[PDB]
Symmetry: D2
Subunit: 453 residues, 4 copies
């Protein structure tokens, strides 16, 4: 045995699965706002001999020898991360070891808070992320709500915007040690200056979790959270278009000096993680260099234009939008004026090769049948979609919604609806016709990555 | 821009760095017991379009659609994991989403314990892992010691073996909810039956963290912790020779066990976000390899090579902690030789031999380790046999002798290290040894791609 | 060797003979109590009968455990006393023993609350109480912007609720809003500086919505509740704590009442009893239990209802007299035993006022008012009726008390016009001859007035 | 109504109960080692107008005015506490507000430890106290084990002595922040110097909880824990013969100063307690002044002589003693060689007006029928008992044990044994005859306190 045989020769079962996934990505319309298509160059670094190296510790301060090259790679990744976000290295440092976005946030909390210290994030049904402290009325769900004490803040349900007035009021009472400014399903720009005002008043750290928007920030097409935040976390995928990994940025130097750096680095290792994934660090460095280019700014400008074109086309077809529009990469569609809930809509769309996700709307009464859908522009913009192409996407979505409305008129519960899509031959024929047109359209656009896997 | 450009064209700076790391791996004698060389097939899956799919949740119970293929891949990985360890799915389930070994352990604790509940693991200087609950006299180090309350168990310093008698005595007083059986620097086999006896008496869960030994267990060349443990965690790299990732195995069915739902919920939604599907696929590739006669032969050769290394060190007057080995590694006590592990590790590094300094029972300075930890897995993957490991030991002995000379000429550890670099006679001696080491190592095959 | 050098110790000697130093101190404290105008709303004067039980051989009995379930034998009489105290507590509050139980062992009010939290909550579980500056108690979970003050905020996670600053009333709307976000496991309805009646029905509505326990901490008002002169928290709360002193006029101790029987049964009783002992306390103080039983029997009488009605009338008369003299009241008046004065329009803060009053033998407390800009200089004064009502003060006597207070406020205003910082004000009261003479004159008049009224307890100690 | 009426006139029901308890105390033989009889002078202070005064805070630092006299009383109590224990006020302070012994310990833990910090105390069945951190295999029992993390240390079962070697071994592993030296059922002197050695090695605070022995310490008839512990708690009752209350002593001054004083005072108030019980503080001060006298030293010497006389009389009759003897105020009798367990024995004794308590012995298999009895000398020594009188006490105990052995031979379960004592005419007559002789003997001795209540 050599371990030099190709995947296609040595594991045909897995090779066929990879090819099937690649074909699915190429023939569908990917509208999941957290999805993107990573470059071949980054993937070549991800599947490299860097996987083999144990390098616990930090550059120049490792537990094991033989780290001279991985030290250069980790330091290069740090420099490229600061450059991508236009950060003065005298004022900011970065930890490039977090395994993903969720590990990055957990490390921040572990670094800066004692167990049971208080955090506030946007509530999950209102557009926040699990790792911002989510628990339900009946059990603690995120580990952030088990090891720490969380209390959510809310949207103003009338406007769909974060209710900064109520956040200021409740933060004075709850006294959080850390407030998280960052979202998973929010179409507007966060008022980071207002968030900093609240944090300064109550003496909380401001963490900006920019995972969804990090590429837009790097491209300077929206305002930067780094102007106001103490700590910034992000994934390296999503709008940054890298391999899956995480980053923690922190202020350093004179504020009396900042005291984040040593605590953040210690929390990542030795407290929480083990050996870094050097292949991921290298792939991230490749993507961060791409994020510095004029090409990436044009891409990010096009993401904003495409989201806006999608929002406009939906308003023209009788849909509503939570918060009335978008200033970023995604759109929050309110399907309630159409009479079809988001659980039914997402499934019809899935069966015609359009991937979107159901989304809770302000005023919804049931989590099983939420009122809306979340639609994103990053992934298809990476396939060279322009505004006219996103208008064609909306035309396909509206066709799918119309099929759903007819199935709704012939079915009762969500389970009946779902089985009908598969069991009713007439419905099945209509979905197949729409799927063929969607896939013929989608296949005509280029795709980042390898050719077949 | 297409995103289809080759790394070598689009990022020459990074491409040169990758090639330099590959050259370092090919020219060195890798004796770090936790290191291995992953196959090209697994690396091809690791750097694939699977990176591009968000699949929070579990097969058939995802948050998002479009998961039909990733569902098949995750289910296949689960099946191959159970097959590699000879497990009946009626008795065992597996979660293939943990991002690494340390995330796997944290998910077990979060699943089964409340904050501040008690755990016992082998102390770090005695051969346990950070994630088994390590804190020092000075501060809480592992997050396992922050979110939970840990108390270590110890080696018997006279034998170098886990002191099962004292573990039982102290577990009765401390009342842990979970005891960890698993090591990072131990050359003998754990008495899992005795660990089960202690856990049954005090009503604690038994977690076996088999990360260091997982390939040996899969190959059935040493006894299996699955005979006795409630939960088993492991890395997918190290002796399993896969991409970096983790696994959690758990008992299910009649005992009924109530681990499955808690374990899966702790991984997601409690701790992690989207799975790394490219890692899951790469792991599945390596697990299929681990089921083969090839892999049993590999693991048998790992044991033979560790024994050959131990025997060669004994013949040259080295002492071994616990007197020898029953697994993939050797624990050398350099104290009787007159050189400590910090000094030896650095000399060896400078001649392209990577090993680990290692705390020994007879150490008198809690700061400077007395020994070295030497492993056979990585070089065995390069087709090294017993005679080749005897040659490795001769190179080590040359390096140790250089270290002894430098020690006689220098005071502090930092003075020793600087002397290796700046004393011209010493650097010439190191250069000569490095060249013989590297020309020996380069002639063996290497798993993976040709140049990166 | 004669006299005391020829007399063996018996432990039966009188305090006045065996410890003259302590006897003189006790008499000095009694004289201070008799000659002052006690306006601290949490103060009262305990009966001689209860004090005779408090200083008794019951001090000598260890009785860890509960009646019929003790660790040690010889408890037959202390069992009867503890059971009698329980029965009298339920009787005083008109409670059916099939629906309510009571634990009579808590050492004081603060131990009672801690036992409830320990019984019903896990460490770090969430509690909400009225904020301290807004009229809550420390034991309802107080921490400052700077550190954790009450042990309730250390072992549990507290978040306050607030007054409506414009009305001076508890903001029930905001409590409901924030309880939905914070998700408390227990909400406390009870105050230390609040002049109005708590809407216990609304508190129970909030608790039912968010699935929290409602604890009523009625320490300040317990006598008024027993006398049925204000509405009872027992109509809406499932746990009630109280001190046995204050308006109940007993020895210092605590009580925990809890629902029991059919709710499917309630599950409070065993947890509450176990938290008191063995979890938190050691041997009960049987002398205090007996003294409490004496006071609880007093609280069941027509005499005590007339006392409690007079407390209400006297607080109202004090409030009216203050309004007639130009003072402002937080919430505009009182429905209970105390009055919250807002001195800000008069131009004198509560720290200055409280110190002037103390120097003329009137004890009151400075009190934070809504809108205050400094805790060192709170805007108000809290004035209570229970203690002087126990000395047979009636409405006209409280009007005379207000006349004295007004003279003290006027002295404070004059000193304020002559001094800068609070420390300068305080020093001026002692060192300026003209001011000290004016204080001495007012003090003489206060003390002759106060000494004329009767006093519960022993004659001289 | 004046509130000046006597208890006998105003509450005849309660008055009769007080008289019945007084008669029970006078006619019985009190052998509970934690019991004593408080002086009339202290009781007169306890039942005084000091009950009426709210004085939250500390002398000169109160929340409310009018505290000039209670300030003098509290300071006098502090001075008398330091005098009773031979302490230099420049080196030691004391907090006199704890409501009882258990509140004193909880305040120390709250002052010096964070929630979930580690404590070690002697296991409850081995002679420790609940408040030193007791939990069973199935439930956390003491609040000390809920809010803090406790692990017990043990006796050497062969010798009946604290196993200092095993304490040192396990303290190195468990890393307690505080170790408690103090017992509720131990007949030997604690090696405080060894305890301090262990604490110094592992960097733990040493707390001496001297509640059982405090009067012996004050009288200087046994060695003082203040030579080796820098924090000491105690009850003010038991061997100190005061009203029920607690004390916390702590080192202060140059140690770089000690930092105990402010943390301990803050923990007592405002953290844990409310208004002090000034009547108890005054009663404690009265008892502490008594504890400074030659009278009290002679009393305490007699306590030791009486416990030794009791032990020797039991040994002469063939009883075994746990640890083989006594060095303090109590005796641990092992009844197993006689064939009668402590639950059976304690109940027979109770029915003849002798109060003792069953006590777990090393090797016992059941807590329902422990092997021994704990017998104390303080209470009867306060009634002028001397050595010959304790020999008479042992004569009565032995008669009771013999009755218990006869009943045991005629009955099966513990419930049958207990029923037989009440329902068998011959047994009830034997008990009545012994009870009459015990009570005739006991009534002849004097009694501290009031005449009838
Ligand atoms: Na329908
Ligand atoms: Na040297
Ligand atoms: Na002024
Ligand atoms: Na029998």
């Amino acid at each position: 045995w050599t371990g030099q045989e190709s995947l296609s020769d040595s594991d045909p079962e897995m090779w066929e699965l990879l090819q099937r996934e690649k074909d699915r990505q190429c023939r569908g319309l990917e509208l999941i706002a957290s999805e993107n298509f990573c470059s071949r160059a980054a993937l070549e670094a991800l599947g490299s001999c860097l996987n083999n190296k144990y390098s616990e510790g930090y550059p120049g301060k490792r537990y094991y020898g033989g780290a001279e090259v991985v030290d250069e790679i980790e330091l290069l990744c740090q420099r490229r991360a600061l450059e991508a976000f236009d950060l003065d290295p005298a004022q900011w440092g970065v930890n490039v070891q977090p395994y993903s976005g969720s590990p990055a946030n957990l490390a921040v909390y572990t670094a800066l808070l004692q167990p049971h210290d208080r955090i506030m994030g946007l509530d999950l049904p209102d557009g926040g992320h699990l790792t911002h402290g989510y628990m339900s009325d009946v059990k603690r769900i995120s580990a952030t709500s088990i090891f720490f004490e969380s209390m959510p803040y809310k949207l103003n349900p009338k406007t769909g915007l974060i209710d900064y007035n109520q956040l200021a009021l409740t933060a004075r009472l709850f006294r959080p040690r850390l407030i998280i400014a960052g979202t998973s399903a929010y179409a507007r720009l966060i008022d980071y200056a207002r968030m900093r005002e609240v944090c300064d008043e109550v003496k909380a750290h401001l963490l900006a979790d920019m995972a969804h928007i990090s590429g837009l920030v790097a491209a300077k097409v929206i305002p930067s959270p780094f102007k106001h935040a103490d700590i910034v976390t992000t994934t390296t995928h999503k709008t940054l278009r890298g391999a899956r990994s995480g980053l923690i940025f922190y202020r350093k130097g004179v504020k009396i000096p900042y005291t984040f750096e040593d605590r953040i680095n210690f929390a990542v290792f030795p407290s929480l993680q083990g050996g870094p994934h050097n292949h991921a660090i290298a792939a991230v460095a490749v993507a961060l260099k791409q994020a510095c280019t004029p090409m990436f700014r044009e891409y990010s400008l096009q993401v904003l234009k495409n989201a806006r074109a999608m929002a406009d086309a939906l308003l023209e077809r009788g849909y509503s939008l939570v918060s009335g529009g978008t200033d970023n990469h995604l759109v929050l569609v309110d399907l309630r004026p159409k009479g079809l809930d988001g659980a039914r809509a997402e499934r019809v769309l899935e069966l015609v090769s359009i991937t979107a996700n159901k989304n809770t709307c302000p005023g919804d009464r049931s989590a099983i049948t939420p009122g809306g859908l979340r639609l994103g522009a990053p992934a298809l913009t990476s396939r060279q979609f322009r505004e006219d192409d996103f208008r064609r996407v909306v035309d396909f979505i509206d066709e799918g919604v119309n099929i759903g409305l007819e199935v709704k008129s012939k079915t009762a519960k969500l389970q009946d609806f779902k089985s009908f899509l598969l069991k009713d031959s007439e419905t099945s024929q209509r979905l197949a016709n729409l799927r063929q047109r969607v896939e013929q359209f989608a296949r005509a656009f280029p795709m980042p990555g390898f050719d077949e896997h």
